[PDB]
């Protein structure tokens, strides 16, 4: 085994390997997609592998739904390494670790490079990861120039609807690191004040009154409230929003299962935000 450093922690893992089981870390699925890593175990979404991942799940068995690792299945696999998530309860990470060397992959989007390089070190694809990272940075440089100065001064928010409720995220979490950090838009105080994924009322949103709203809605994450979006859209308080009246609401401009803090999420969000904020596909 070889010493792998990841966010001031060291793990001994047999590398390079393909015996990788991914549970909870949708981030690592997105890194696997761009690195062309075909893991032994991957996350299922309502019992299937989404079309967007089918090119890297061809060799994989499901580890379970994102939040619900099947420890018996993961044991069955005897992976060289398990890519878990920092979003699991600690007790659940401990249980996962009974099936093998377990690395909790960070959901903090500012760690996107470290996450990619982790998977790259595990699979011998450092050169490929660095090229991907370099290409994002070049894309960011070019894209920033294509977005008008008024757009860059607007009040923009990313929300995700889960079980029919509205969630915001910290400045360095989800897509916010790209929207505020990379593109330079100003994070609303409610985002600055968020300590983690945080429920926001439609009432509070109406006071924030953003100019632009990116709404992410996965049917899979709203099985309890399937019409949540149409219901929202008919609400008088939602209808009072500046963004809603100006037709500046962008629903699923990136696939709603996208996690935000990955190369792939960032490049997709960079382009979507460019198009939507400038209201022109040329961006």
């Amino acid at each position: 085994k070889k010493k792998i450093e990841y966010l001031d922690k060291t793990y001994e893992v047999t590398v390079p390997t393909d015996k990788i089981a991914i549970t909870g870390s949708v981030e690592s699925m997105e890194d696997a997609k761009l690195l062309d890593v075909h893991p032994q175990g991957a996350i299922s979404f309502s019992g299937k592998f989404p079309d967007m991942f089918k090119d890297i799940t061809d060799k994989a068995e499901p580890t379970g739904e994102k939040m619900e690792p099947n420890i018996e299945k993961i044991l069955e696999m005897k992976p060289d390494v398990i890519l878990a998530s920092t979003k699991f309860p600690e007790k659940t990470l401990q249980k996962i670790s009974t099936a093998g060397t377990t690395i909790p992959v960070s959901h903090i989007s500012s760690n996107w490079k470290e996450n990619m390089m982790l998977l790259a070190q595990l699979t011998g694809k450092e050169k490929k990861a660095k090229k991907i990272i370099a290409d994002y940075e070049q894309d960011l440089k070019e894209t920033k120039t294509k977005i008008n100065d008024k757009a860059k001064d607007s009040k923009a928010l990313v929300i995700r609807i889960r079980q029919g409720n509205i969630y915001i995220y910290p400045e360095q979490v989800y897509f916010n690191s790209t929207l505020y950090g990379d593109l330079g838009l100003k994070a609303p105080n409610e985002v600055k004040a968020a300590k983690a994924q945080e429920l926001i009322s439609l009432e509070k949103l109406s006071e924030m009154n953003p100019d632009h709203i990116f709404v992410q809605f996965s049917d899979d994450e709203n099985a309890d409230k399937p019409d949540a979006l149409k219901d929202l859209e008919k609400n008088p308080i939602w209808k009072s929003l500046k963004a809603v009246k100006e037709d500046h609401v962008y629903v699923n401009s990136v696939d709603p299962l996208a996690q935000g803090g990955t190369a792939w999420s960032k490049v997709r969000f960079l382009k979507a935000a460019a198009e939507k904020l400038t209201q022109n596909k040329l961006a």
Partner: peptide
């Protein structure tokens, strides 16, 4: 599933 929407 607590990164808390829990």
């Amino acid at each position: 599933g607590t990164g808390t929407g829990t």
